Amino acid sequence: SETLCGGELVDTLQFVCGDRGFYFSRPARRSRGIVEECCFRSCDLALLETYCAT
Amino acid sequence: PKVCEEEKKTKTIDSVTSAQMLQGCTIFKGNLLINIRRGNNIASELENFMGLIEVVTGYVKIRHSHALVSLSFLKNLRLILGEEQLEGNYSFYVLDNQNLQQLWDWDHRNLTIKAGKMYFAFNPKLCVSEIYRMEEVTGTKGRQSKGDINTRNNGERASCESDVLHFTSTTTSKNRIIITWHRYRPPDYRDLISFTVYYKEAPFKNVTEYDGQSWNMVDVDLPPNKDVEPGILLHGLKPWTQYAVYVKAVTLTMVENDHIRGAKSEILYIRTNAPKTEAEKQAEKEEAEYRKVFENFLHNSIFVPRP
Amino acid sequence: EICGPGIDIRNDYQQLKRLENCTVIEGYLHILLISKAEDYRSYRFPKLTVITEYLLLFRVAGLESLGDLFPNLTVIRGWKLFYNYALVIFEMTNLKDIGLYNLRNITRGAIRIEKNADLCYLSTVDWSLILDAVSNNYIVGNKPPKECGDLCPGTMCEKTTINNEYNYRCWTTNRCQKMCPSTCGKRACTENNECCHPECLGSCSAPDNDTACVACRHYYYAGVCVPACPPNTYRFEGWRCVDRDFCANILSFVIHDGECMQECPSGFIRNGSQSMYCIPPKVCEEEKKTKTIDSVTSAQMLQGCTIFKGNLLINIRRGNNIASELENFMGLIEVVTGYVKIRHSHALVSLSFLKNLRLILGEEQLEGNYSFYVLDNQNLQQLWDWDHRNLTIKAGKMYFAFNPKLCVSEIYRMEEVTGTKGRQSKGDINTRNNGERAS
Numbered sequence A: 001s002e003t004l005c006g007g008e009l010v011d012t013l014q015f016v017c018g019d020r021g022f023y024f025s026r027p028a029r030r031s032r033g034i035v036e037e038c039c040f041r042s043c044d045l046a047l048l049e050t051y052c053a054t
Numbered sequence B: 001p002k003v004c005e006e007e008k009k010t011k012t013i014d015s016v017t018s019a020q021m022l023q024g025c026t027i028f029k030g031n032l033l034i035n036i037r038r039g040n041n042i043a044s045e046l047e048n049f050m051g052l053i054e055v056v057t058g059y060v061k062i063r064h065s066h067a068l069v070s071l072s073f074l075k076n077l078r079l080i081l082g083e084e085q086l087e088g089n090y091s092f093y094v095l096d097n098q099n100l101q102q103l104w105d106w107d108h109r110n111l112t113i114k115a116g117k118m119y120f121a122f123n124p125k126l127c128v129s130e131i132y133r134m135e136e137v138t139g140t141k142g143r144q145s146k147g148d149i150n151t152r153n154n155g156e157r158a159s160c161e162s163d164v165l166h167f168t169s170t171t172t173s174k175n176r177i178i179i180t181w182h183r184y185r186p187p188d189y190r191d192l193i194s195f196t197v198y199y200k201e202a203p204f205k206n207v208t209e210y211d212g213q214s215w216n217m218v219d220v221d222l223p224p225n226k227d228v229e230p231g232i233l234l235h236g237l238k239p240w241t242q243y244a245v246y247v248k249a250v251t252l253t254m255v256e257n258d259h260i261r262g263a264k265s266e267i268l269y270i271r272t273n274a275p276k277t278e279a280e281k282q283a284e285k286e287e288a289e290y291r292k293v294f295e296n297f298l299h300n301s302i303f304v305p306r307p
Numbered sequence C: 001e002i003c004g005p006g007i008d009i010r011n012d013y014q015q016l017k018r019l020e021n022c023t024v025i026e027g028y029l030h031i032l033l034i035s036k037a038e039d040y041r042s043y044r045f046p047k048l049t050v051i052t053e054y055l056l057l058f059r060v061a062g063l064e065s066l067g068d069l070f071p072n073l074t075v076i077r078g079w080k081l082f083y084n085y086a087l088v089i090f091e092m093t094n095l096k097d098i099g100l101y102n103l104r105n106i107t108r109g110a111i112r113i114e115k116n117a118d119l120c121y122l123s124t125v126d127w128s129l130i131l132d133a134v135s136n137n138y139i140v141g142n143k144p145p146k147e148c149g150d151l152c153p154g155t156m157c158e159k160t161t162i163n164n165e166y167n168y169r170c171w172t173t174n175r176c177q178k179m180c181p182s183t184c185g186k187r188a189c190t191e192n193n194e195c196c197h198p199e200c201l202g203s204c205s206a207p208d209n210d211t212a213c214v215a216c217r218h219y220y221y222a223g224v225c226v227p228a229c230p231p232n233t234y235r236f237e238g239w240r241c242v243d244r245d246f247c248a249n250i251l252s253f254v255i256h257d258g259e260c261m262q263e264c265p266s267g268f269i270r271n272g273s274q275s276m277y278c279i280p281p282k283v284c285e286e287e288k289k290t291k292t293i294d295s296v297t298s299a300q301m302l303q304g305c306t307i308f309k310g311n312l313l314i315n316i317r318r319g320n321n322i323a324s325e326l327e328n329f330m331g332l333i334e335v336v337t338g339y340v341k342i343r344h345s346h347a348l349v350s351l352s353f354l355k356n357l358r359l360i361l362g363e364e365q366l367e368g369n370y371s372f373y374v375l376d377n378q379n380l381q382q383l384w385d386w387d388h389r390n391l392t393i394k395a396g397k398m399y400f401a402f403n404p405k406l407c408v409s410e411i412y413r414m415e416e417v418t419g420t421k422g423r424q425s426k427g428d429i430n431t432r433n434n435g436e437r438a439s
């Protein structure tokens, strides 16, 4: 997949993160958007575990 | 054929009524101007009053002529003679033509320019990739140089390369057509907002999109099941008759310009067996224009990666 | 409890028990991605009554109605916003109806309620009673109009000219839009609709006792709503008054003009003689080269920046009066050191709000070396460049295109006061599309 952006982005994210759940912390933090990282630019389907808790 | 001499060095044409005098002129020993601001169906009648015009001894100028998407009404043209090569020594000149989509320059017809180069500016919808063909076919292959035909505004908003839609399946009756096409995924699936389907009665194949708009327009929306490739019912068509059909994708030509791709079918001809609205340009666009960006913001904000 | 600094809730309903003690949230609330959809009606939070910032719900796939969660949620002050919106309710794939039936004021932002697959009871509730400026609301794409059959019981309910309708108003099939009669005028009211103290916002446990308010239409202090903070008490986080015992003991602060604040504003600075002294510049940072601006949320990040050492983009598709806020955040910007660009900003009539902008240094440029650029601004009738006020471009070209309502004489007058003729073609500042339809 070259790019992913909409509902299918939150679906593929829920699929990869599964039941571990998403990480979140207060912006306290960097101003770089996942969408620029994976919809405009060519996305990496192995990165999107990096958003999940561990 | 008949030669015409006209009293001005240049006959301006402002209207059908002023073209009317040239009706049945074939060889026009003068310059021409076209300055056609507004008016209905005009191109259909200008082919009658001028389409036989094939040899222009002067220059030819077109200006402000926002009425004209297509030059197809100058059917046959063969010669422009350069006897009045302009400043820069130009003999064909089109300027500020804020709707010009298509020259006559097409597989069916060649041209000759005897002398005097070509000029183009502020033609926002005439793709800069189209004219490269026209200047070669006209024989002026390398006479022009960079600034003589600017690249900046000409065709600046035009969809100058389109993906191809495939007709997947077709069906017909003695008065109906049903037709389908592959699920066009644009690169970012929100970018598509709808499909437009055009059809017209076209008993001979010598047809193009730009035939004046005589194209019946149909608006059809992608069914929300992403497993269904789209299709339409076309109904109440003439029996025992050929119809022509083609499809253009509707896409948000913003954010990325030419990386918003645009898509078009080839033309399809069908023999049958023996409404439009004004504002939907925006009033639909609005509801993806101002929803896609909010989604992109929400996704940028809500997710944050671990270290 | 006065919870904070802000609540982000995701993954599971079982984390939601963190709300069991909160009654005011000094921050946003997020409820996100609760994909299990299962626990549903195991949870309640009647303690909660005011949210000082926006509320975001996203894909909470299990939930029928928020009135099961937040029956009393009475004010959403909106002191921060989420893309102009103070409430967002998005892709609630099972949400039938809002509830929130006690909700009685939204004190700043608009609403965006969108895509909700099953949401009845949209706009059968007078948003002009609950908030000003209904024209900023954006209710779109939900369950389409004819499919619901929105009702109140017996419909026998509280009513109004719902816009140019005349109808019963209904939060949900069980509950009217509980409303305080016009006899109250500007006042709120208690149960039995008796009009309360003019510092109450929303309901009130007893009539016209200042202690009785639920929430305060100006400030809260020591259990009483008050129109302004007492002597020696500082306004904090836009709803409560505090003293040095708090503001000194917020984790890494300063005090100024009776605000308690994270830093001294423009024209004031730390004096180390004592850390309270914001003694009489302010620089915004960068990380993207392109600090795009699109909403009050992205503009609020500039609030009181004097020197913006980056490049702007402006993109304001919608928003009836947003310039009134953008002046408040951005009008203090005297310098942009990069380029500037404007795009598709169909809401702007004028740059007037860029109040004190002096300079555009063009340290960084567009392709084509444009240090300023203006495209497709279908309503920008006016530049802020009235000759009273200077604007100096210290390098590089201008560009202008497709500004249909902007008279060329105006952009030429700018060419005069910027003195900047010797840098552009016919195209870059053309008549042939800029102002072509200007009245």
Ligand SMILES: *[C@@H]1O[C@H](CO)[C@@H](O)[C@H](O)[C@H]1NC(C)=O
Residues within 6 Å of the ligand: B203, B204, B206
């Ligand atoms: C196309 O073919 C038809 C023959 O059916 C002919 O009458 C017509 O002149 C041709 N050209 C155009 C432009 O239709």
Ligand SMILES: *[C@@H]1O[C@H](CO)[C@@H](O)[C@H](O)[C@H]1NC(C)=O
Residues within 6 Å of the ligand: C017, C018, C019, C020, C021
């Ligand atoms: C709520 O407050 C009570 C009383 O102090 C305490 O026992 C309980 O643990 C608190 N729970 C949470 C989640 O804060």
Ligand SMILES: *[C@@H]1O[C@H](CO)[C@@H](O)[C@H](O)[C@H]1NC(C)=O
Residues within 6 Å of the ligand: C104, C105, C106, C107, C128, C129, C130, C131, C132, C201, C217
């Ligand atoms: C909400 O409260 C604010 C307080 O400033 C007020 O301006 C606004 O008009 C109120 N709206 C309603 C509907 O009470």
Ligand SMILES: *[C@@H]1O[C@H](CO)[C@@H](O)[C@H](O)[C@H]1NC(C)=O
Residues within 6 Å of the ligand: C364, C365, C368, C369
């Ligand atoms: C245009 O911008 C680039 C980068 O700032 C600069 O190096 C160049 O000298 C400028 N002038 C041109 C390209 O004429």
